[PDB]
Design a protein around this ligand. Structure first.
Ligand SMILES: Cc1cn([C@H]2C=C[C@@H](COP(=O)(O)OP(=O)(O)OP(=O)(O)O)O2)c(=O)[nH]c1=O
Ligand SMILES: [Mg+2]
Ligand SMILES: [Mg+2]
Lengths: 412, 555
DNA sequence: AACGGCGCCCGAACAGGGACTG
DNA sequence: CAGTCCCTGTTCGGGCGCCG
């Protein structure tokens, strides 16, 4: 009884044609059970080989959840319909969400299964369930309703979502609600008891209309930044000062007032690296001035809503991971550090996966965008293991880099 | 008026703005003429082919080749121009079934659908785009032109349509017999069950009659009721499997195309024969781009070929997968970037073997390559069995711990254990984390002219030691590496080296033990001889330390 | 002389970053 | 500041094996 909102690809782009990757046994058995129920409910339908489009599919378990969740890698289809969920029917991002004391993330993707999808667009939601040892050919489906993980789903459902959230927003004018992908970000300044109580009221508000019982809690007011810090030693060697001048020189690309004149004068000659060099009166002054500049904010650094977010990550060792979010080089909008995450001191890929998810969650709260990541890992290493540790219902873009640490810039 | 088959048709369109094929026939021998006129007449009576007239302005040439191990001929259509104008299909065949992934079944039956493509219909609105003439005489009768009502052999949409149609027909039968495994690859059907031999044939005949409802015939010619079953090019026995006999050519004079076939069969043989190498054989296929050019076998390529033939002498076999037991994968280093592995569940009962010998990167080490081998085995195991095997690796836990904790890139190996089988994988040198007290400090640098290709490399030290070496036909990057090589040559067992070269430092910090660069290999050899090496980096052209002094010498 | 699938080892074409030169 | 170079990386298409 709902007219299908017409959806069109961006001009000059065809549908996604991404190959399905191998899946573990437990994931295939989970997807077969999930897709059989969805097909019985009419949410998906089997298709043939005349649909040349395809999108990868796998399954995940959210944090502290034992239930499988179907996850579709709609990253290719999303950027081929970008003029829809950003130009035609966009969702405004509230600047106050990051200022709230507590923010709960609710999975509302199951509500999208009630709205039908445009018949002319269902062919672009095709996916293929693989088989172990290639016992059978691929089992292909397509979506009949709004699919989870597609950026067009919250855009079309936004009209329905507003009417559902309208009585609750009038009841609580101080609560900030933001919708991104399959998630609903609910932020308030109430106490932990009052907040979780109001979250349950919103849950009951949605029930009167399978992961709604979960509630991942955030505290953006407690989010910290990791500035550039300089070492403080009682004695300085030639090697110490050579590392300091190298670090300050690279930092000059961000802070133009940093000077290294008086510090480079200490290294006049051809000295041994372990020779202790006492700091002169001018060197103490120049080093103290550079410490204040590193505390000052960078000039002309603000968010441009028309530019993509870029996230770089560095592996610092011993469970330490630093990161910077920026749109222009040396114009970091945020720098931070993670430590002692899951997999610390045993699994680099699990930690890197966790860091990517944390950074993306912060970017959704602060700017409403997911950044494109520059991952310090080999492509084959990441593509072998990352799905084993992914616990989010969205997937950011990423590329793979290899930058040896010539100087520890973000973590001494 | 042709009857519509029970199989649901697949709607096939074409690329917009394009029409159908209009290609002239190919003059063939009179032998092929008397082997296609009889086919188009039989298929016309069976409803598989209808005759057309002048209202079909299309044409496509056809040819025929003898079937392997059969008196019957095979008809193929050269639809290469039709494929360029036909819509793209997504292939539902995601891989090739491997016998090591098969589980133990009490009874096994291998079927084979007769006239596979000729039993699945074509789209109604698409039959008009398949026109072709058949001359009964090479230059007399013009020959009445026919069309296709089924799937032609040679069309790029025929495999995907058949594989998808076969699945929809088997879906109701598999729902009625859940405990029966049916490996469906193209037309061949592997049917296995734990039922008794008597009860197994009963369900086989139920399946044979089930497929017959859609016009799919399973003749007794290719019906396999007893081992050894020939399935996917293997010999399947009740408790073991093996590859069909692999014959390697033995020529007195070897050319390029002969080695390509030789290396190919050794790759196919390495799935069950442990220890096969094709490094020195494939090395002969470099540079030369003439498939009909004789290439003499090098002494390394000859010994490699001799060792592979002796491996193929003794008959080897693989076993089947038992889900109740764990998966074990063990790797050995074969040297020269060559790795071999075995996957098994019981000791010395290999499910399958394999090799990893890919050389990625100009500079690397055995630890990086072992990591890449583990990743290849993991993905291979997820395809075949859907799970990661426990690894037995020839690297100490302490060695692996030192590497991944100190590497700047994320790297990981799944659950594994150390196996003490030499040659062990180790790191051949360790760069110090702090400068070495009492070790001479070398400030190295190198510069080269872009035009004349001339350059200099050298160093200055805190003790006054100095060197400048002129170099010809070099680059800025080479002189920086050369400067470090000089500092290693002229220093004691412990040395601190200061460079401004991000290029050279990035190579050495990754602790390579092998390189395509002779200069890097010489540097690696020096690094191994040292007891303590500390590499430090400073920005160039900043008047920092002795780096400013050595910069004047080499520039 | 046809089609589709997977694997390997190969080379040519292309991309991207430090670094030098106009 | 551009425009190159040197170097190293990925992508892809073809060679071969093998299946149907
Ligand atoms: C071997 C082969 C096969 N095919 C396609 C056609 C039918 C299926 C199966 O081929 P087949 O089993 O050997 O022959 P088929 O048509 O089934 O006829 P029968 O020999 O089984 O009676 O794959 C092909 O197009 N080209 C080929 O070279
Ligand atoms: Mg057959
Ligand atoms: Mg230099």
């Amino acid at each position: 009884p709902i007219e299908t909102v017409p959806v069109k690809l961006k001009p000059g782009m065809d549908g996604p044609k991404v190959k399905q990757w191998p899946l573990t046994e437990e994931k295939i058995k989970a997807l077969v059970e999930i897709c059989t129920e969805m097909e019985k409910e009419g949410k998906i339908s089997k298709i043939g080989p005349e649909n040349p489009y395809n999108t990868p599919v796998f399954a995940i378990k959210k944090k502290d959840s034992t239930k499988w969740r179907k996850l579709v890698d709609f990253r290719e289809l999303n950027k081929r319909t970008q003029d829809f969920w950003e130009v035609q029917l966009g969702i405004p991002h509230p600047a106050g969400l990051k200022k709230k004391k507590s923010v709960t993330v609710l999975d509302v993707g199951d509500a999208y299964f009630s709205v039908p999808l445009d018949e002319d667009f269902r062919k672009y939601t095709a996916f293929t369930i693989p088989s172990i040892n290639n016992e059978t050919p691929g089992i292909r489906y397509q979506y009949n309703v709004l699919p989870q993980g597609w950026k067009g789903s919250p855009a079309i459902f936004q009209s329905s979502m507003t009417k559902i959230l309208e009585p609750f927003k009038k009841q609580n004018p101080d609560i900030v609600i933001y919708q991104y992908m399959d998630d609903l970000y609910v932020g308030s300044d109430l106490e932990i008891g009052q907040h979780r109580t109001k979250i349950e009221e919103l849950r009951q508000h949605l029930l009167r209309w399978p992961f709604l019982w979960m509630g991942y809690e955030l505290h953006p007011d407690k989010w910290t930044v990791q500035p550039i810090v300089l070492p403080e030693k009682d004695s300085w060697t030639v090697n110490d000062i050579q590392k300091l001048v190298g670090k300050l020189n690279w930092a000059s690309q961000i802070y133009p007032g940093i000077k290294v004149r008086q510090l480079s004068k200490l290294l006049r000659g051809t000295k041994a690296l372990t020779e202790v060099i006492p700091l002169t009166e001018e060197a103490e002054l120049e080093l103290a001035e550079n410490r204040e500049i590193l505390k000052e904010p960078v000039h002309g650094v603000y968010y441009d809503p028309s530019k993509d977010l870029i996230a770089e990550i560095q592996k610092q060792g011993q469970g330490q991971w630093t990161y910077q979010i920026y749109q222009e080089p040396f114009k970091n909008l945020k720098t931070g550090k993670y430590a002692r995450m899951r997999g610390a001191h045993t699994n680099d890929v699990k930690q890197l996966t966790e860091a990517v998810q944390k950074i993306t969650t912060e970017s959704i709260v602060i700017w409403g965008k997911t950044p494109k990541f520059k991952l310090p890992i080999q492509k084959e290493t990441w593509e072998t293991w990352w799905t084993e540790y992914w616990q989010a219902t969205w997937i950011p873009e990423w590329e793979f880099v290899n930058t040896p640490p010539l100087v520890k810039l973000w973590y001494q | 008026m042709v009857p519509i088959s029970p199989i649901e048709t697949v709607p096939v369109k074409l690329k917009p703005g394009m029409d159908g094929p209009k290609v002239k026939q190919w003059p063939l021998t009179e032998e092929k003429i008397k082997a296609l006129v009889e086919i188009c007449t039989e298929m016309e009576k069976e409803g598989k082919i209808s005759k057309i007239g002048p209202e079909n302005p299309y044409n496509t040439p056809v040819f025929a080749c003898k079937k392997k191990d059969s008196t019957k001929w095979r008809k193929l259509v050269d639809f290469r121009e039709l494929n360029k104008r036909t819509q793209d299909f997504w292939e539902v065949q995601l891989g090739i079934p491997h016998p090591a992934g098969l589980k133990k079944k009490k009874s096994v039956t291998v079927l084979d659908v007769g006239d596979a493509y000729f039993s699945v219909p074509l789209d109604e609105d698409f039959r008009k785009y398949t026109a072709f003439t058949i001359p009964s005489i090479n230059n007399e009768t013009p020959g009445i032109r026919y069309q296709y009502n089924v799937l032609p052999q040679g069309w790029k949409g025929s495999p995907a349509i058949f594989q998808s149609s076969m699945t929809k027909i088997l879906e109701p039968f598999k729902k009625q017999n859940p405990d029966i495994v049916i490996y469906q690859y193209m037309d061949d059907l592997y049917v296995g069950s734990d039922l008794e031999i008597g009860q197994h044939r009963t369900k086989i005949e139920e399946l044979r009659q089930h497929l017959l409802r859609w016009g799919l015939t399973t003749p007794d010619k290719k019906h396999q009721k007893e081992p050894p079953f020939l399935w996917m090019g293997y010999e399947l026995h009740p408790d073991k499997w093996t590859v069909q006999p692999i014959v390697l050519p033995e020529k007195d004079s070897w050319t390029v195309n002969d080695i390509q076939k030789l290396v190919g069969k050794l790759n196919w043989a390495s799935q069950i024969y442990p220890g096969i190498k094709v490094r020195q054989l494939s090395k002969l296929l470099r540079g030369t781009k003439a498939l009909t050019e004789v290439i003499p076998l090098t002494e390394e390529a000859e010994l490699e070929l001799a060792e592979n033939r002796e491996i193929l002498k003794e008959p080897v076999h693989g076993v089947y997968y038992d889900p109740s037991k764990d998966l074990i994968a063990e790797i050995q280093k074969q040297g020269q970037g060559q790795w071999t592995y075995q996957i098994y569940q019981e000791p010395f009962k290999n499910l399958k073997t394999g090799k990893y010998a890919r050389m990625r990167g100009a500079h690397t080490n055995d630890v990086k390559q072992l990591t890449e081998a583990v990743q290849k085995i993991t993905t291979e195991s997820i395809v075949i069995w859907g799970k990661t095997p426990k690894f037995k690796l020839p690297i100490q836990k302490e060695t692996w711990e030192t590497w991944w904790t100190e590497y700047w890139q994320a790297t990981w190996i799944p659950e594994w254990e150390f196996v003490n089988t030499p040659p062990l994988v180790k790191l051949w040198y360790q760069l110090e984390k702090e400068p070495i007290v009492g070790a001479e400090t070398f400030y190295v640098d190198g510069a080269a002219n872009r035009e004349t290709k001339l350059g200099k490399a050298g160093y200055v030290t805190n003790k006054g030691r100095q060197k400048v070496v002129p170099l010809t036909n070099t680059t800025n990057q080479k002189t920086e590496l050369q400067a470090i090589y000089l500092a290693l040559q002229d220093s004691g067992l412990e040395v601190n080296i200061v460079t401004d070269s991000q290029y050279a430092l990035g190579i050495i910090q990754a602790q390579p033990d092998k390189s395509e660069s002779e200069l890097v290999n010489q540097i690696i050899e020096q690094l191994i001889k040292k007891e303590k090496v500390y590499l430090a980096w400073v920005p160039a052209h900043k008047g920092i330390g002795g780096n400013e002094q050595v910069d004047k010498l080499v520039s």
